[PDB]
Structure 1
Amino acid sequence: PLSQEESTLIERATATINSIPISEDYSVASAALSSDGRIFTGVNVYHFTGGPCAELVVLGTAAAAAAGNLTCIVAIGNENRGILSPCGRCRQVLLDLHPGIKAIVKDSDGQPTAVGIRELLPS
């Protein structure tokens, strides 16, 4: 079971993706919590040259607000796809820029769980 704040991240990212026109280019929303309690959101920008995932848009949005360290992040796909784990590129960026962060993923029983980013890039 997630913390109350972590649950609100899922709610916020879900509301964000549900709110925008269905799009092939803008198909995932993300929300992150800063250590001060603020929440930052974002949607991906698909492009073959590596347009940012929603998580990276969130990182730049948090940075624009001088948010500092982020503690948890989640991504939610459109059309009711629900929680999506961060992709490998986002794992690398998250580890490198916010090594203390957790990402919300679905556990082996399909239940949301916040996992330390290092555990998502094991040896």
Structure 2
Amino acid sequence: PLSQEESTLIERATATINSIPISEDYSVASAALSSDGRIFTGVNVYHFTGGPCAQLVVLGTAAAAAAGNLTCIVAIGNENRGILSPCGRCRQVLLDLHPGIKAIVKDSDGQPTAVGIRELLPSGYVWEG
């Protein structure tokens, strides 16, 4: 079910996306929890050349703070869309940079659940053998 740390991430990313002007360029926020308990937030940057999803912005934000390993991450869409699953590219970046991470997604009953990244990319390509 819904733990406190999980709930806090959802709350943090929701507040971030709700606080900013409605935009088609900046339309999703993410929040991640680090091993040491810090939370890092970000929003996406839309671009046809592969502007970062919100989760990638969060990864650079976390790395800028020397956060180390991230344990959980969630993305929240604008306009009351709620939890969005990480896109395939996010999943690959997460698997390669934070193999221990979980992402919050909606389960088969619509309920938020924290899932190991490996389960979100079955038979995953692993970069560098």
Structure-2-length-normalised TM-score? 0.94
Superposed CA deviations along residues 4-33 of structure 1, whole A, max 9, x for unmatched, are 111100000000000000000000000000
Shift of 1:77: 0.2
Counterparts of 2:62 and 2:116, CA distance in 1: 19
Report SS of the residue matched to 1:42: strand
Counterparts of 2:71 and 2:2, CA distance in 1: 13
What residue in structure 1 maps to residue 15 of structure 2? Answer: 15
Counterparts of 1:118 and 1:95, CA distance in 2: 7
Counterparts of 1:2 and 1:100, CA distance in 2: 20
Superposed CA deviations along residues 76-104 of structure 1, whole A, max 9, x for unmatched, are 00000000000000000000000000000
Query: What RMSD, in angstroms, separates the aligned Cα atoms of the two structures?
Result: 0.5
Identify unmatched segments of 5+ residues in structure 1. none
Is contact 1:30-1:73 (8 Å) kept? yes
Counterparts of 1:69 and 1:25, CA distance in 2: 28
Superposed CA deviations along residues 37-64 of structure 1, whole A, max 9, x for unmatched, are 0000000000000000000000000000
Shift of 1:3: 2.1
Is contact 1:44-1:52 (8 Å) kept? yes
The higher radius of gyration belongs to: 2
Counterparts of 1:2 and 1:74, CA distance in 2: 13
Aligned residues between the structures: 123
Identify unmatched segments of 5+ residues in structure 2. 124-129
Structure-1-length-normalised TM-score? 0.99
